[PDB]
Design a protein around this ligand. Structure first.
Ligand SMILES: CC(=O)c1cccc(CC(=O)N2CCC[C@H]2C(=O)Nc2cccc(Br)n2)c1
Length: 217
């Protein structure tokens, strides 16, 4: 997160760190007891998911790491494209739920969020252009852009004027009126430059796919 603030410990109880050989790689969103949604290129052998966390290193009563049982990228995702950039991860067991670990409802109705609406993006991605990795969760509020300024029906844009998502925030949520609307893209892009808006996959565009994966296993 660039130009943001430190999040309040555990106030975003859906927030997941998606980790690869022990280190944070991507954000994620607890959407059911045993399913975290992230982005497709968050994949590249040993994948895990930390729930209930504010600090990645420090001891917290709610922190729980989990093994991943199944990794389901969207079938139409490609390693070199930003389309269909979703990934579902089934956890090893169902998450121990509490005030600090709670699934986030996702938008099932396929209407765009109103342009100008500020939505909340949280993550452990880089906080500057030198690559600094924060210990504790960060967030920033970002105004949503109309479709034509964005320029897919399946993607949505947010302003990137200093305040922005960046490397390592990929796969984490964009939240608007307490509902998940967006998942941060996992393709490379310049951050912090108002002329290159943030890109987030509209989850409502993929209600059929998600369900069809959350039916099973
Ligand atoms: C969303 C966006 O603005 C943006 C910009 C540039 C780059 C990216 C891509 C991105 O992040 N990834 C690609 C898949 C792995 C993940 C990553 O590289 N994870 C990571 C690496 C080092 C430190 C940290 Br913390 N995380 C997104």
């Amino acid at each position: 997160i660039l130009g943001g603030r430190e999040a309040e410990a555990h106030a975003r109880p859906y927030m997941a760190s998606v980790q690869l050989n022990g280190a944070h790689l991507c954000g994620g969103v607890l959407v059911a007891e045993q399913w975290v949604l992230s982005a497709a290129h968050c994949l590249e052998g040993k994948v895990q998911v930390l729930l209930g966390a504010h600090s990645l290193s420090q001891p917290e009563p709610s922190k729980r790491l989990y093994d991943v049982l199944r990794a389901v990228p969207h079938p139409d995702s490609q390693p070199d494209t930003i389309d269909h950039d979703l990934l579902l991860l089934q956890l090893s067991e169902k998450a121990t739920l509490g005030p600090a670990v709670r699934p986030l409802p996702w938008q099932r109705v396929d209407r765009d969020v109103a342009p100008g609406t500020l939505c909340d993006v949280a993550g452990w991605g880089i906080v500057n252009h030198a690559g600094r990795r924060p210990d504790s969760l960060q967030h920033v509020l970002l105004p949503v852009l109309d479709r034509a300024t964005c320029n897919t029906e399946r993607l949505m844009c947010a302003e990137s004027n200093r305040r922005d998502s960046c490397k390592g925030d990929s796969g984490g949520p964009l939240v608007c009126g307490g509902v998940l609307e967006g998942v941060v893209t996992s393709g490379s892009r310049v951050c912090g430059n108002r002329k290159k808006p943030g890109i987030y996959t509209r989850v409502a565009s993929y209600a059929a796919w998600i369900d069809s994966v959350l039916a099973s296993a």
